[PDB]
Design a protein around this ligand. Structure first.
Ligand SMILES: NC(=O)c1ccc[n+]([C@@H]2O[C@H](COP(=O)([O-])OP(=O)(O)OC[C@H]3O[C@@H](n4cnc5c(N)ncnc54)[C@H](OP(=O)(O)O)[C@@H]3O)[C@@H](O)[C@H]2O)c1
Ligand SMILES: Nc1nc2[nH]cnc2c(=O)[nH]1
Lengths: 259, 254
C-alpha cells in the first residue's frame, strides 16, 4: 500500500564472481544502468505524477538489486504522496544506495524529456547475419577457444541474439550486446556461437555480462575490452550492465528498438 | 515448449460490453493495435531471429485476445524453427485471426526498421497539470455529470495518468466536437480508474460510452496507449467516425 523500502532485496555480486574465479580485485570496472519506465507516485495534493527513472549502480557495489523486488518497491510509491519530485529523487537515491551498498545515481525525468528522442542501434559491425547451423543450445565457453588469432585490431562488434532464462520460471530475457576491444582480431562465427549458447543458461543480466567479459578475457586475451548489454525490460524495469577494462560508464544511454 | 496455438485465449467482447448497456449496433468503430517487442524464433538452421511485430485487431471481432495468453503463445515461437520470415508472419495472421474471429493484420519488422524512429507524445493539450486535490480514487462515472457545458468546440485533450489495477499504465487521447469539457471533471474521472479492474480495451470502451452519455459530443475518439506487460502492449482506439490512428509510434513509457 504505502512506500516501503523493506521490499528491496539485495543479491551479493560475490555469488557469481566466485563462480567466475574472480578475486576481490576485479578485472573490470563499470556499472549497471537501469531504466524505470513506470515510476509513479502522488504529489502533495494526491494527483498522480509519472516519470522515467534512470539509475546507475556501480559495479563495485557489494550487491545488485533483485529486479522483482525493485519493481515491488517502486509500486509502493504509487499511492504515496511525496512533497516534490526532488523528494522522490532523494528517497530513491537513499534506498537504492543502502540496498546496493554504494552510492547510486538517480535521475527522475519527466516524460516530455523523451519527446522526439530517436531509437538507436548499437555501434560497429552486427555479427548476426551468418549462414551457420546451430546443433545444440547448451552453454559452452570453449566455443571461444582459439577465437582470437587474427591481426591486432581495434573494433566494435554487436549482436541482438542474446537470450538467457530467468533463474526460476525459465521465462526468457532478451538482450543486445556490444563488444569493443583492442587485441587479436576475433573470429565472428565463434563469438556468435558463444553468445547463442547462452539461450538456455540461467543467470542474472549482470552475471551474464561479467561472464562474457571474463570468458573473452581468458580465451581471447584482448589488451582492452568493453562489454555493454542492453536488455528488454521485465516488470517495467530494464538493466543494461556495462563492464570495461578501462571505462567506468558508457558515453551514451539511449534505448534500443526492443527496449 | 515449442509452437502451440492452443495457448491463445479468446475473450468474447460481449462479456464486458454487456455491462456498458450498448445499443444493438455498436456506437463506435476502431481497433486494438498491439506491439510485440519480443518476437523471436529460430531459422531453418537453428539460428535465432528477432523482430518486432505490429498487430491490428478490428474492434468488431467477436473476441479479444487475453494478453498473458498472447505472450505465452509468442514465447512458443522462441525455440521453434521456421523456414522463413514470411512463414512466421503468415502463421501469426492465421492464428490470431482464428482467435479473434475476424481477420487481423500483422507486420513483422526487422529491428533495423526502428533505427531513428521517434518516441512521440499525444495530440492536443495535456490536462494533467492541474492544481486540484484528489484523495478518493474510487471509480465514479458520475464525475462526468454536467461536465460538458462549454460552447461548441473541437479539441483534443490527453492525460498520462491512466492506471488500472499488479498495476497497468497508460496515456489516453480524447478528440471531440461538442460542448467544451470541464478538464477538472475529466481528469478526476480518468484518475478514478486507478483502483478498479477491467481489460485495457474495456477501459477505453467505458471512457467512450461514458463521455458519449454524459457529454453528448457530435463526434468522439478515445485512444489509449498502454505500457507493455510481458513484452507486448495494447493500444485500443475507439471512435464515432475514425477507423484507426495514423501510426503506431511508441510513447515515452512504452
Ligand atoms: C520482474 O518483474 C516481473 C513481474 O512479474 P509480476 O509479479 O508482475 O507477474 P507474474 O505473474 O509473476 O509475471 C510473469 C511474466 O508474465 C508477464 N505477465 C503477467 N501478467 C500478464 C498479462 N496479464 N499480460 C501479459 N503479460 C503478463 C509478466 O510481464 P511483466 O514482466 O511486464 O509484469 C512477466 O513477464 C517478475 O516476473 C520479475 O522477474
Ligand atoms: N538484478 C537482477 N534481478 C533479477 N531478477 C531476475 N532476473 C534478474 C536479473 O537479471 N538481474
Amino acid at each position: 500500500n504505502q512506500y516501503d523500502p523493506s521490499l528491496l532485496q539485495p543479491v551479493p555480486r560475490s555469488l557469481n564472481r566466485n563462480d567466475l574465479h574472480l578475486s576481490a580485485t576485479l578485472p573490470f570496472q563499470g556499472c549497471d544502468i537501469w531504466t524505470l519506465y513506470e515510476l509513479s507516485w502522488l504529489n502533495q495534493k494526491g494527483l498522480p505524477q509519472v516519470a522515467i527513472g534512470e539509475v546507475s549502480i556501480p559495479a563495485t557495489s557489494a550487491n545488485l538489486i533483485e529486479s522483482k523486488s525493485f519493481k515491488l518497491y517502486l509500486n509502493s510509491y504509487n499511492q504515496t504522496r511525496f512533497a516534490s519530485w526532488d523528494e522522490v529523487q532523494t528517497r530513491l537515491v537513499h534506498d537504492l544506495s543502502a540496498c546496493a551498498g554504494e552510492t547510486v545515481t538517480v535521475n527522475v525525468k519527466s516524460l516530455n524529456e523523451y519527446t522526439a528522442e530517436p531509437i538507436v542501434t548499437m555501434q560497429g559491425e552486427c555479427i548476426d547475419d551468418q549462414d551457420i547451423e546451430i546443433a545444440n543450445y547448451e552453454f559452452d565457453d570453449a566455443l571461444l577457444q582459439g577465437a582470437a588469432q587474427g591481426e591486432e585490431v581495434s573494433e566494435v562488434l554487436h549482436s541482438h541474439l542474446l537470450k538467457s532464462n530467468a533463474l526460476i520460471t525459465n521465462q526468457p530475457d532478451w538482450g543486445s550486446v556490444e563488444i569493443a576491444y583492442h587485441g587479436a582480431k576475433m573470429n565472428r562465427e565463434a563469438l556468435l556461437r558463444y553468445l547463442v549458447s547462452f539461450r538456455e543458461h540461467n543467470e542474472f543480466h549482470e552475471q551474464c555480462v561479467e561472464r562474457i567479459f571474463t570468458d573473452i578475457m581468458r580465451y581471447c586475451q584482448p589488451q582492452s575490452l568493453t562489454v555493454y548489454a542492453r536488455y528488454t525490460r521485465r516488470g517495467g524495469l530494464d538493466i543494461n550492465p556495462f563492464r570495461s577494462s578501462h571505462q567506468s560508464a558508457p558515453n551514451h544511454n539511449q534505448r534500443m528498438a526492443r527496449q
